[PDB]
Amino acid sequence: SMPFPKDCSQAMLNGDTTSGLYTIYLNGDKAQALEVFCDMTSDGGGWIVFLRRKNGRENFYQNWKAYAAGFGDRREEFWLGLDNLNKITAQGQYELRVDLRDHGETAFAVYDKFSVGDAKTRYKLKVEGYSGTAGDSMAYHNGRSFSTFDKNCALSYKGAFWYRNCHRVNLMGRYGDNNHSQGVNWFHWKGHEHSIQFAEMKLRPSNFRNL
Ligand SMILES: O=C(COc1ccc(F)cc1)n1cccc1
């Protein structure tokens, strides 16, 4: 019903309730088509998934240009791209949800306010307004620029993130690596010596809860 939906909340309200690949249009512009994976089932649906870890098949030890542009298989392990995340989060007030699952246990984190700055900010993270069960591990990272090995936390832990000194969240770390701080970590859920089997990061308009 919305011809050029700008996110997965506008694609869902279009009656599409099946999780999978949808076209969104940044700023509603039919010339800024982007293929995204929509999670239409987790807490009301309408989520753009921008990170998925689930089997270790994809390499996340990738350079600045790869993190800027995105990589992987949207149906499996992928990173959507920082330029995409900046352009999406510029369209309105968005909320971040993180879904975690490991050996049958689940946890989540929601941040009422989530934004990614442009390349001039080195894609600065904003995350505020925590609730959930995983523990607030992103607060540590709030206001940090993105880091890759070629722009050293990324090099030392062989991943990429809004690193500080160095992390409480390492969802782009080495799959199944339980060595301290090397793996897919969410520190305030499973610490630094437990790599998480399944992880998704996703966003939708913060006002979706009552739209
Ligand atoms: O590299 C990609 C697509 O590769 C991707 C794979 C997965 C993904 F989610 C995002 C991007 N580019 C680079 C410029 C336009 C698209």
Coordinates of C-alpha atoms and ligand atoms in Angstrom, one line a residue:
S1 CA 0.0 0.0 0.0
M2 CA 3.0 2.3 0.5
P3 CA 4.7 2.3 -2.9
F4 CA 8.3 3.1 -1.7
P5 CA 8.5 2.0 1.9
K6 CA 11.5 3.5 3.7
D7 CA 12.0 0.6 6.2
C8 CA 10.6 -2.8 7.2
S9 CA 7.8 -1.1 9.3
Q10 CA 6.4 0.6 6.2
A11 CA 6.8 -2.8 4.3
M12 CA 5.0 -4.8 7.1
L13 CA 2.1 -2.2 7.4
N14 CA 1.9 -3.0 3.6
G15 CA 0.4 -6.3 5.0
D16 CA 3.6 -8.4 4.3
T17 CA 3.9 -10.4 7.6
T18 CA 6.4 -13.0 6.3
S19 CA 10.1 -12.6 7.4
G20 CA 12.4 -12.5 4.3
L21 CA 13.8 -10.1 1.6
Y22 CA 12.0 -6.9 0.8
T23 CA 12.9 -3.8 -1.1
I24 CA 13.0 -0.5 0.8
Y25 CA 13.7 3.0 -0.6
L26 CA 15.9 5.3 1.4
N27 CA 14.0 8.6 2.0
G28 CA 11.1 7.1 0.0
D29 CA 13.1 7.8 -3.2
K30 CA 12.4 5.1 -5.9
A31 CA 16.0 5.6 -7.1
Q32 CA 17.5 4.6 -3.6
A33 CA 16.2 0.9 -3.7
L34 CA 17.9 -1.3 -1.0
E35 CA 17.3 -5.1 -0.6
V36 CA 16.9 -5.8 3.2
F37 CA 16.0 -8.9 5.3
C38 CA 12.8 -7.9 7.3
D39 CA 12.2 -9.8 10.6
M40 CA 8.4 -9.5 10.7
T41 CA 7.8 -11.8 13.8
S42 CA 10.1 -10.6 16.7
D43 CA 8.3 -8.2 19.1
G44 CA 5.7 -7.0 16.6
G45 CA 7.9 -7.3 13.4
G46 CA 8.9 -4.4 11.0
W47 CA 12.6 -4.8 11.8
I48 CA 15.5 -4.3 9.2
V49 CA 18.0 -7.0 10.2
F50 CA 21.5 -5.5 9.7
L51 CA 23.7 -8.2 11.3
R52 CA 23.2 -12.0 11.5
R53 CA 25.6 -14.6 13.0
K54 CA 24.4 -18.2 13.0
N55 CA 27.0 -20.7 11.6
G56 CA 30.5 -19.2 11.1
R57 CA 30.4 -19.6 7.3
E58 CA 31.0 -15.9 6.6
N59 CA 34.2 -13.9 7.3
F60 CA 33.6 -10.8 9.5
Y61 CA 37.3 -9.9 9.6
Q62 CA 36.8 -7.4 6.8
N63 CA 38.1 -3.9 5.9
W64 CA 36.6 -0.4 6.2
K65 CA 35.3 -0.4 2.6
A66 CA 33.6 -3.8 3.3
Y67 CA 32.0 -2.5 6.6
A68 CA 31.0 0.8 4.8
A69 CA 29.3 -1.1 1.9
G70 CA 28.0 -4.3 3.5
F71 CA 28.8 -8.0 2.7
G72 CA 27.4 -11.5 3.0
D73 CA 24.1 -13.3 2.2
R74 CA 21.1 -11.5 3.6
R75 CA 19.3 -14.9 4.1
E76 CA 22.3 -16.1 6.2
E77 CA 25.3 -14.3 7.7
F78 CA 25.8 -10.7 6.6
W79 CA 26.5 -7.1 7.5
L80 CA 24.1 -4.5 5.9
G81 CA 26.7 -1.7 5.6
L82 CA 27.4 1.5 7.7
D83 CA 26.4 3.8 4.8
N84 CA 23.0 2.1 4.6
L85 CA 22.7 2.3 8.4
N86 CA 23.5 6.0 8.4
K87 CA 21.0 6.7 5.6
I88 CA 18.2 4.6 7.3
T89 CA 18.7 6.1 10.8
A90 CA 18.8 9.7 9.2
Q91 CA 15.1 9.1 8.1
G92 CA 13.6 9.4 11.6
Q93 CA 14.0 8.2 15.2
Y94 CA 14.9 4.5 15.2
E95 CA 15.2 1.8 17.9
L96 CA 17.8 -1.0 18.0
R97 CA 16.9 -4.5 18.9
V98 CA 19.5 -7.3 19.5
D99 CA 18.3 -10.9 19.6
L100 CA 20.8 -13.5 21.1
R101 CA 20.4 -17.3 21.3
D102 CA 23.0 -19.8 22.6
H103 CA 22.5 -23.5 23.5
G104 CA 18.7 -22.9 23.8
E105 CA 18.8 -19.7 26.0
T106 CA 17.7 -16.4 24.5
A107 CA 18.1 -12.8 25.5
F108 CA 17.5 -9.4 23.9
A109 CA 18.3 -5.7 24.3
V110 CA 16.3 -2.8 22.9
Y111 CA 17.6 0.8 22.7
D112 CA 14.8 3.4 22.3
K113 CA 17.3 5.7 20.3
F114 CA 19.7 4.3 17.8
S115 CA 21.6 6.2 15.1
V116 CA 24.8 5.8 13.0
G117 CA 26.6 9.0 11.9
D118 CA 27.9 9.6 8.3
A119 CA 31.5 8.8 7.1
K120 CA 32.7 12.3 8.4
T121 CA 31.9 11.0 12.0
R122 CA 33.5 7.6 11.1
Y123 CA 29.9 6.2 11.5
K124 CA 29.6 7.3 15.2
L125 CA 27.2 5.1 17.2
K126 CA 24.3 6.6 19.3
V127 CA 22.5 4.1 21.5
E128 CA 20.3 5.3 24.4
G129 CA 17.2 4.0 26.3
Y130 CA 18.0 0.4 27.2
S131 CA 15.6 -2.3 28.2
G132 CA 15.9 -6.1 28.0
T133 CA 17.3 -9.3 29.4
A134 CA 20.9 -9.4 27.8
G135 CA 22.2 -6.6 30.0
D136 CA 23.1 -3.1 28.8
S137 CA 26.5 -3.9 27.0
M138 CA 26.1 -1.2 24.3
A139 CA 26.3 1.7 26.9
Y140 CA 30.1 1.1 27.0
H141 CA 30.2 1.7 23.1
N142 CA 27.9 4.8 23.0
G143 CA 29.3 7.7 21.0
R144 CA 32.3 5.7 19.6
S145 CA 33.4 5.8 15.9
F146 CA 33.5 2.5 14.0
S147 CA 36.9 0.7 13.7
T148 CA 38.2 -1.9 11.3
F149 CA 41.8 -3.2 11.2
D150 CA 42.7 -0.7 8.4
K151 CA 41.1 2.3 10.2
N152 CA 44.2 -1.7 17.6
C153 CA 41.0 -3.4 18.8
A154 CA 39.9 -4.7 15.4
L155 CA 43.4 -6.1 14.6
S156 CA 43.9 -7.6 18.2
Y157 CA 40.4 -9.3 18.4
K158 CA 40.2 -9.9 14.5
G159 CA 36.7 -8.3 14.2
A160 CA 35.1 -4.9 13.6
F161 CA 32.9 -2.7 15.9
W162 CA 32.4 0.7 17.5
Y163 CA 35.5 -0.3 19.6
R164 CA 36.5 1.6 22.8
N165 CA 39.2 -0.1 25.0
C166 CA 38.1 -2.6 23.7
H167 CA 34.6 -4.1 23.9
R168 CA 31.6 -5.4 25.9
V169 CA 29.9 -6.2 22.5
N170 CA 31.8 -8.1 19.7
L171 CA 29.0 -9.5 17.5
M172 CA 31.2 -9.2 14.4
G173 CA 34.0 -11.3 16.2
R174 CA 35.3 -14.8 15.3
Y175 CA 32.5 -17.4 15.2
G176 CA 32.8 -20.1 17.9
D177 CA 36.0 -18.5 19.4
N178 CA 35.8 -18.9 23.3
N179 CA 39.3 -17.4 23.8
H180 CA 38.9 -14.2 25.9
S181 CA 37.3 -11.3 23.9
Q182 CA 37.9 -13.1 20.5
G183 CA 34.4 -14.4 19.9
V184 CA 30.8 -13.3 19.3
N185 CA 30.5 -11.7 22.8
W186 CA 27.8 -9.9 24.7
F187 CA 29.7 -9.4 28.0
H188 CA 26.8 -8.7 30.4
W189 CA 25.0 -11.9 29.2
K190 CA 27.7 -14.5 28.6
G191 CA 31.1 -12.8 29.4
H192 CA 34.3 -12.7 27.3
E193 CA 35.0 -16.5 27.2
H194 CA 31.7 -17.6 25.5
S195 CA 31.1 -17.1 21.8
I196 CA 27.3 -16.7 21.1
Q197 CA 25.9 -19.2 18.5
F198 CA 23.1 -16.8 17.2
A199 CA 23.0 -13.0 17.1
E200 CA 20.9 -10.5 15.1
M201 CA 21.0 -6.6 15.2
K202 CA 17.9 -4.9 13.7
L203 CA 16.2 -1.5 13.6
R204 CA 12.7 0.1 13.1
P205 CA 11.1 3.4 14.0
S206 CA 11.0 3.9 17.8
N207 CA 7.3 5.1 17.4
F208 CA 6.3 1.7 15.9
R209 CA 5.2 0.4 19.3
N210 CA 2.1 2.8 19.1
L211 CA 1.9 4.0 15.4
Ligands
LIG1 O1 28.6 -5.2 -1.4 C1 27.5 -4.8 -1.7 C2 26.3 -5.7 -1.5 O2 27.0 -6.7 -0.7 C3 26.2 -6.7 0.4 C4 25.9 -8.0 0.9 C5 25.1 -8.1 1.9 C6 24.6 -6.9 2.5 F1 23.7 -7.1 3.4 C7 24.9 -5.7 2.1 C8 25.7 -5.6 1.0 N1 27.3 -3.7 -2.3 C9 28.3 -2.7 -2.4 C10 27.7 -1.5 -3.1 C11 26.2 -1.9 -3.3 C12 26.0 -3.3 -2.7

